[PDB]
Amino acid sequence: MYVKLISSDGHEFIVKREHALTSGTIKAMLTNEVNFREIPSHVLSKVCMYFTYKVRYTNSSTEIPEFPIAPEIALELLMAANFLDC
Amino acid sequence: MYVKLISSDGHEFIVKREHALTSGTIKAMLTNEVNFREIPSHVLSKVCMYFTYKVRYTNSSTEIPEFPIAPEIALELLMAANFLDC
Amino acid sequence: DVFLMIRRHKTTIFTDAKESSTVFELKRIVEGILKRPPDEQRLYKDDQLLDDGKTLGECGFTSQTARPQAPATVGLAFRCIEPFSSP
Amino acid sequence: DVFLMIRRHKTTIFTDAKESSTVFELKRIVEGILKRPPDEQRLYKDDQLLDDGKTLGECGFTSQTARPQAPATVGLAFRLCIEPFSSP
Amino acid sequence: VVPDQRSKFENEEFFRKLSRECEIKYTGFRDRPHEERQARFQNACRDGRSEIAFVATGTNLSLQFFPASWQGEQRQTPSREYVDLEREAGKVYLKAPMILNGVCVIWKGWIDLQRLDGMGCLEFDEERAQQEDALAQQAFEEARRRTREFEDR
Amino acid sequence: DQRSKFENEEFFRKLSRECEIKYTGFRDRPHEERQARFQNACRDGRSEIAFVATGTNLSLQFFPASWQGEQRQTPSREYVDLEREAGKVYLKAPMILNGVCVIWKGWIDLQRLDGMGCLEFDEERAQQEDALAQQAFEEARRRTREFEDR
Amino acid sequence: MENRWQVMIVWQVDRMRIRTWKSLVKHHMYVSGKARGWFYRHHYESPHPRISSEVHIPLGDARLVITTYWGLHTGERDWHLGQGVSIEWRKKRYSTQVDPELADQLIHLYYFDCFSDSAIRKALLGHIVSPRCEYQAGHNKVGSLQYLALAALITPKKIKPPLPSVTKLTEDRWNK
Amino acid sequence: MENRWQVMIVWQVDRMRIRTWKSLVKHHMYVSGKARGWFYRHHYESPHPRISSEVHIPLGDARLVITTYWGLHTGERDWHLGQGVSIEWRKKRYSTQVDPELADQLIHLYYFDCFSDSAIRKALLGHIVSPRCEYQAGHNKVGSLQYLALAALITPKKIKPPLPSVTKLTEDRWNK
Amino acid sequence: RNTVERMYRDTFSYNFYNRPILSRRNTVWLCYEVKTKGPSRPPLDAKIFRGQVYSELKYHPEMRFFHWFSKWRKLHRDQEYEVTWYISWSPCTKCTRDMATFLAEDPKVTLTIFVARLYYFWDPDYQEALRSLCQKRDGPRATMKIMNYDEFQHCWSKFVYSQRELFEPWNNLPKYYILLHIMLGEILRHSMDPPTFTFNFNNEPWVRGRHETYLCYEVERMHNDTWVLLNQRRGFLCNQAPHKHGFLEGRHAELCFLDVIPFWKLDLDQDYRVTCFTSWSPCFSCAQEMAKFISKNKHVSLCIFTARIYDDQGRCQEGLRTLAEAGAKISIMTYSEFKHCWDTFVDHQGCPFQPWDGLDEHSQDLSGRLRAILQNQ
Amino acid sequence: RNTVERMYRDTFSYNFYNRPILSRRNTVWLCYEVKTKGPSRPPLDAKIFRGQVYSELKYHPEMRFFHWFSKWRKLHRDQEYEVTWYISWSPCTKCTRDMATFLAEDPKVTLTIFVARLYYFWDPDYQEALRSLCQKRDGPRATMKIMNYDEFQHCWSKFVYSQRELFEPWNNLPKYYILLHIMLGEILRHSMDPPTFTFNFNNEPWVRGRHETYLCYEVERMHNDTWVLLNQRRGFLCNQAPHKHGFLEGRHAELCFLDVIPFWKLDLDQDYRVTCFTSWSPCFSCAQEMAKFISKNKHVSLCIFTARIYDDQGRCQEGLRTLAEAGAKISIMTYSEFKHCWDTFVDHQGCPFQPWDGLDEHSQDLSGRLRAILQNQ
RNA sequence: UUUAAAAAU
RNA sequence: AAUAAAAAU
Ligand SMILES: [Zn+2]
Ligand SMILES: [Zn+2]
Ligand SMILES: [Zn+2]
Ligand SMILES: [Zn+2]
Ligand SMILES: [Zn+2]
Ligand SMILES: [Zn+2]
């Protein structure tokens, strides 16, 4: 019930299939393993965090918390989002 | 070296000759005892306070203190002042 | 419900769990992935070993500590707090 | 220097005194008017009898406490009645 | 569109209201005395020439009840709206047909006359859905899904 | 009269006391530059030099007499002299303050750029100055405007 | 007979908020072209004894009506919340109420400029991104990570005075 | 040949205080008639390289001259106090410097309206007193009981903007 | 700044111009004067406060004035004061409520307000607040009035940097004053004292000493085939005796009525009936203008009711017929109409109506005369 | 309200009137634009800031701009920014010093300030602050310039609520611009680039391409029968090429100089000597204008040191003769004068002066020619 | 003529 | 034409 993601640096995450369904690329791909050529470990963690947040508040329309971002990581986070169409 | 002042209400004060010399009435009158027909005891206290105040700060022209007064006492204090020609 | 992140040996897992759930349920959840008995597994928080009998409330952690954008970070051991990558 | 007011039996005296002046000097000062020996007379502050030997610094009162517009208030006794001022 | 309407009614939290028992209070004439407050409440309810306000404690939502004559013209009402006290000893029942975010809904409530407070709940409407204009329904349904993000060229 | 005024009134926010004074020219420049420019100003006499009491707002300004032009000969003529001492410079300045003629005498240590200054009564020019003007000023400073109107 | 009644969800605000809304709408309608085409009906152009002002935003073939009300029944004792606001959506004879958040969402779809399609690839290439989104009220929803990252990289313009958003108009500072 | 100098006492002040002094003097000279007769000589009307302005106040036969100065190095390291003020009192050729407080007292003796000789008479009669001392800085010395009592009885007028006073001009801010 | 001794001519002329509907006058100027209770004496204090209308409630001229006044009040604790305001804009709603609170707290101050324009005069909440602050005679009495030529001229005299000269009123000062007085009377629901009504409403054929014409008016609206009253629109007004500074030519009450009808912004698509009660019948010019207005505006109907028929030089018969051809019904008050006017437009204090001798006979005589006048042409 | 996206036409026409001496412009309007290094592209941000001159220092538009910029700069540390100011009044002394400090802290901000008018340009302390902010190259460059037709038009196109109307220059725009340009050149102590001096100042009998007159000046004052230099009065200026937007008939350097002289406010009771060094002799019209100016201003003596004689149609000889007769002393530049000009009015960077070929011979020949012209009549 | 009013500053 | 500038608001 979990999809395994391998960071380009050689780290491992696992995220529920429903969470990964939000990403078009992973949804099309899903085999139970995925390898990301360019996404670093921290960017994979951040996109997993985005999945977590969106799933938590996908349907709620009241008092949506903030999603912290940092300028230094924003560029590659946007690159990863584009690649994943998230 | 001390002049005696009698409050009309039945109270006694004393103040040095020089301090009283600031007042025209007492200066002309002075005998070592003075009786005032109308000045209440509190007004006598205030006028003695003024005497000591000015004797302390007559010469100094630097950082002079404020001399407290209250509106409710103002009329009687003014009457005493005009009577005493201070 | 609160989200949690468990990292160990450069392996990471993300999950959601109830507030009152005890550490035994946490070990049960991670068992379905790591396929080992809950008994030997021991958790860690701030590099402090968590005994077999533990609960969220007793630990002092609250729903505010674990958030979707800021889950509680707890290590794991079997019978190393690896930092995340950098730019 | 500081200015002081002493009230006893509806008799009051206005005079100045040095900061370090001890109560003995104060009794000497009041002697010239009250014609009584210093020894038996006893002073008072906030309804608290003052020993025969007392000094300003030990008492804690300072030049800030006593002003020409608000001299230190002290009672007196012979061998106590804090009579307030009259009213409008 | 009826199945989609039902699905959204059941699953999507659309307003501050959570489609559950919500306490409400009468807001009219608060500074006036309690007896006067309820006397005017009943007099307006009987006469029907005044507007009636109810506020939910936990939110800023209000239900403001306007006489139908105030609006410019009479509107066709396939359902019936009512506000009466007779059904109970001292309880007034309120029925309010509405259209919330494109889904037709019935807001039901009751208020105790003595305490000038009560509760309200929200229920799906099925009969009127077919009555409503399917053109407007589908156009609204399409419009509430589109996103301005990257929409244009 | 003048002597009694000077001794009594402690007039003009200065009590004729040996007071701290310091040179303030070019506080931003480094110490050596400050001293060099102070020495040049003292010798050449084409610039201005100011001596300020340490803990107050008063300051004595020396401006070249050329700037104001219209020179007036002054008895006990002011001077800024370095001849008296190798390490010190002496300053003497006649003045008139609140109707009494005075002298200000001070000294500055060129090494520390500070020192002491004091005020001294002047007996000579007091009788020389116009009687009418000083009498008028004395009258003016005695009056009070209160209740003076008709 | 039984009385005929009409019911409406009347948001509740203080008078100052309504006056600020009115001012902002007027300014952005006349002085600035950002709200041109909006219609502002004065208090004397409605027979309703309680309507204070109607603002009509033509959403293409549809319409969005924001109505303020005077002398409402709330009659709050402090008087701090005596007036009110309401939002509605019109198309011919259809009529429905809308969320304040959904109301601005629908507003931003047409009028205020937002990030164009090419803004994703511009960030990839590093090319200057333009035009930028100036109406954050139109994206209160949980947007895609692409949009959020783009917004973080390049911050929105903060026009002065602020653009009119129903969300700001209809909120409860009192209880919060 | 020994060098010659002129010696003046210069109360150091900051720019804003001198600016305000100038503004108030001009206002009360032109806008209001209270300071009618004062002369204000600009910066270009004096050969002195350092002067910045001059305010001449005709005190009967005599005159009072408030001067301000530019570009003095005397000012503090922070350069807050780069400017300075000075007061002289001139009568034909005779001259003498004046204390700021004595300057204010002398000023009040001529220009601003003060309590009339019948002020006390009317005060003890209970009738109105017209006019009243509008200039408090001119009575810096502690005076006769008459004044303290009368002032305590009737509050002085507060002119807006405040009347110009040297004592306020030369007040020491930081070295309180 | 915030306080100023006076103000320049430019600002005075720009801000105190009293057109009922002005934009761009975003500042409020409050010229205040304080006097001791009773006999006239020079004000103990007088200045001006400024404030933006959009600034926080604490910075409004009224709130600033009262914040200053509270502290100023603790010098003579036992004195009672009169306060007079001259304000370009009427106080806001919040300022009105807070002034009511402050005045209730301290019953030892009298407050009089003079206002150039009426800020948001069409706001129901503002009308309620003004009624609370000013209507009560038992409660806090805070008088409010409109500024006329005299008030503006006094403000010029004592609150302007006007190098000694004369005040030149702008174009339409009296028209704007009468419009604002009518509007304010409607808002506060003024009412005639019984003596004026008694001495002016009588139907006796022969009268003496009544040369000023009164009028009362009330609007009504069609809805559901029924007449529904508008408690908003009710009030009475009279004619202006010619005066130098007012309309040089006397302004008739009917003319003021006509000038004010447009202001209510009566909707064209609806139908209104305006019921007017007059002590004297309309004069020739008044009737002509009324008929012209009625003809131009086809969405309004008029209903005039006259107490004493006025026929001085015979010109009135033509005017009555023009009114009739216009479409304005005309009648005479019977007992019922007199009593209705008494109970709707008088401060009767609950007292009953007291008809005078021979009311019915004189009313019937007037009805016969009017019928004879109208039937024939 | 402090920030505005645009200002209205009245505001622009009232606040940016560039007369050197304007009162009642109590507000400082600061339009600004922020750009990045690289190809020209639309500004990242562009708005306006407001503030009185007498408000607290923290509210002046310059401090507000820098407070906003500090936070707005967090996003991209690596980025290096260009700032352009269009400010009605030039910054104050305290603001000038704090701006110097701010730019000192951040070496990645290049600031240009376009001023309509110069504020307190006669204050020595302000002059020192301006020199520290601008003249000193060790501190980060903060360029300052006066606004011309181009800058006013750019503002009117981007910082005003214009409805596609066209910019309408006021009466004396170019005159005031040139006065302010000369004053700012005086205060900032600009110097001639060596190439311009070498090309324009050669005294060779025959030359080609030089159609512009350069005029350096310096004033001196009588004190104790001695000439004391006024270091504040020292600079140079060139002629204005004719332009449709500026002067239709471009002004000669002499006319600009005579227009500036009245703004030095030279004292009437003293005596001044004004020395001018030129590359060309005055023309006929310039000669008459200078002669009239000297005749009317008896407290000014004029000395001219020319490099070459400009003769055309024979009127130049008459012009020189009348100029000499008016009182002015005309002579020719020799080696000493050339070296003095080089060391005074040129940015020599410590380098020495290199006399050119035939300098002495040409100087002697021109001296003989001038003697003949001035003596023959 | 017009301003329903922070439509500006 | 004049404003040396908080002489204004
Ligand atoms: Zn957008
Ligand atoms: Zn006085
Ligand atoms: Zn208000
Ligand atoms: Zn008539
Ligand atoms: Zn500044
Ligand atoms: Zn020429």
Numbering used by the authors:
A (entry chain J), B (entry chain E): 17 to 46, 57 to 112
C (entry chain I): 2 to 80, 89 to 96
D (entry chain D): 2 to 80, 88 to 96
E (entry chain H): 4 to 156
F (entry chain C): 7 to 156
G (entry chain G), H (entry chain B): 1 to 176
I (entry chain F), J (entry chain A): 6 to 382
Article passage:
Two-dimensional (2D) classification indicates that the complex is a dimer of A3G–VCBC protomers. Second, in addition to RNA binding, A3G self-association is required for its packaging into virions. Our structure indicates that Vif binding to A3G is mutually exclusive due to its ability to self-associate. Whereas A3G–VCBC forms dimers, within each dimeric assembly A3G forms little or no self-association. Nucleotides that are 3′ to the primary Vif–A3G interaction site may template an additional copy of the Vif E3 ligase to cooperatively reinforce Vif–A3G interactions and ubiquitination.
The lentiviral protein Vif inhibits A3G packaging into virions by targeting it for ubiquitin-mediated proteolysis, and through ubiquitin-independent mechanisms that are poorly understood. To target A3 family members for ubiquitination and degradation, Vif hijacks a host Cullin-RING ubiquitin ligase (CRL) complex and a transcription cofactor core-binding factor beta (CBFβ).
